[PDB]
Amino acid sequence: LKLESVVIVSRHGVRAPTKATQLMQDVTPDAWPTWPVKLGWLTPRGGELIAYLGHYQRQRLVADGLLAKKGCPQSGQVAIIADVDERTRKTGEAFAAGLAPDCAITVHTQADTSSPDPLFNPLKTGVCQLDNANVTDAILSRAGGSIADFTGHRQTAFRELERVLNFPQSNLCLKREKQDESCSLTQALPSELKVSADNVSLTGAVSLASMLTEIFLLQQAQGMPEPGWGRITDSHQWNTLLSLHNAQFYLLQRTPEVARSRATPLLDLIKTALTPHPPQKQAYGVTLPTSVLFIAGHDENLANLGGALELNWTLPGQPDNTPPGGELVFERWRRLSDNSQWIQVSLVFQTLQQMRDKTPLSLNTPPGEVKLTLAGCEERNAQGMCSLAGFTQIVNEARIPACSL
Ligand code: NI
Incomplete structure (x- = not known):
């Protein structure tokens, strides 16, 4: 050749x-x-x-x-x-x-x-323009039928992100506690699929997590001394974190x-x-x-x-x-x-x-x-x-x- x-x-x-x-x-x-x-x-x-x-x-x-x-x-x-x-x-x-x-x-x-x-x-x-109905149904199907199905099969990785954030000690969590609670990312920030003629996005924890884990990765690649305040310590953790970023791209961009x-x-x-x-x-x-x-x-x-x-x-x-x-x-x-x-x-x-x-x-x-x-x-x-x-x-x-x- x-x-x-x-x-x-x-x-x-x-x-x-x-x-x-x-x-x-x-x-x-x-x-x-x-x-x-x-x-x-x-x-x-x-x-x-x-x-x-x-x-x-x-x-x-x-x-x-x-x-x-x-x-x-x-x-x-x-x-x-x-x-x-x-x-x-x-x-x-x-x-x-x-x-x-x-x-x-x-x-x-x-x-x-x-x-x-x-x-x-x-x-x-x-x-x-995108076809609203076809896009909504296609994305929801690739997520497993619903965005609740999608996040439920990923609690392990969301829990990983919470640990790296020290989420339990955060302002969001401290408030949730004074307020009947659920100190989990997915439930504090419910995720909705928003489909418009020019864009698709997720709200809430899915999109927040895609962005935060990418930031962690950028800090590592930038050579910053302690990405994720030093709490990301082995490749298993890195992979688990960025799986949320990859999953959002699987839904919103690979579909x-x-x-x-x-x-x-x-x-x-x-x-x-x-x-x-x-x-x-x-x-x-x-x-x-x-x-x-x-x-x-x-x-x-x-x-x-x-x-x-x-x-x-x-x-x-x-x-x-x-x-x-x-x-x-x-x-x-x-x-x-x-x-x-x-x-x-x-x-x-x-x-x-x-x-x-x-x-x-x-x-x-x-x-x-x-x-x-x-x-x-x-x-x-x-x-x-x-x-x-x-x-x-x-x-x-x-x-x-x-x-x-
Ligand atoms: Ni990416």
């Missing part, structure tokens, strides 16, 4: 929390550690972890014969697209700095950076009734980058197809793509299934025996310890990687890849044309 093309859909790197709410204060007697950047911004350490991934990808793509060992990629051989958020733009630059240092590869965004880019979520600008719509512009972009065709300037002034395309997005995007293309995974050593800097990697491979075209999909990521130790990455110290398979592919090769035609058929089935740009 010979590597012809690669599209990397990446989550942004380590960032500060996006919000600092009263409820976050009320559920723990302890003080949340402060962060060195504004809310939701990439930290400098976050960018350094992304550059490690970019350096590794250069070494890997050189070894695969797609990029030259020395010099800068010439004229669009590498292209970078990023969401308008600071954290995604800065992730773009960090990846370029690791992959091709001092080559000044442009980080393209949409023209207006003060407005949402529908590429990373067409619901957000009203390009299309096909949400994922297929939300992922349609990215699906179109991916297919455009991977399909052989006379090179032509398309979205963002980027010429496609080309050799490497890096797209700096969000964890909803990785989850959306996973849900739409029936790609299932868990990340060994990385409690967050859609971690900072995690990469959904699409590759087009040409089989020399008959010159047929094949698509390979992988999830490339830093383990939590590689982020904790700021481990420089290389061929001899690679990031983790999980081989994926498109569950619906009818034509696979011995190595698990889907034929170009099979992948194209799968994409055309999964995408929602009303959600296209």
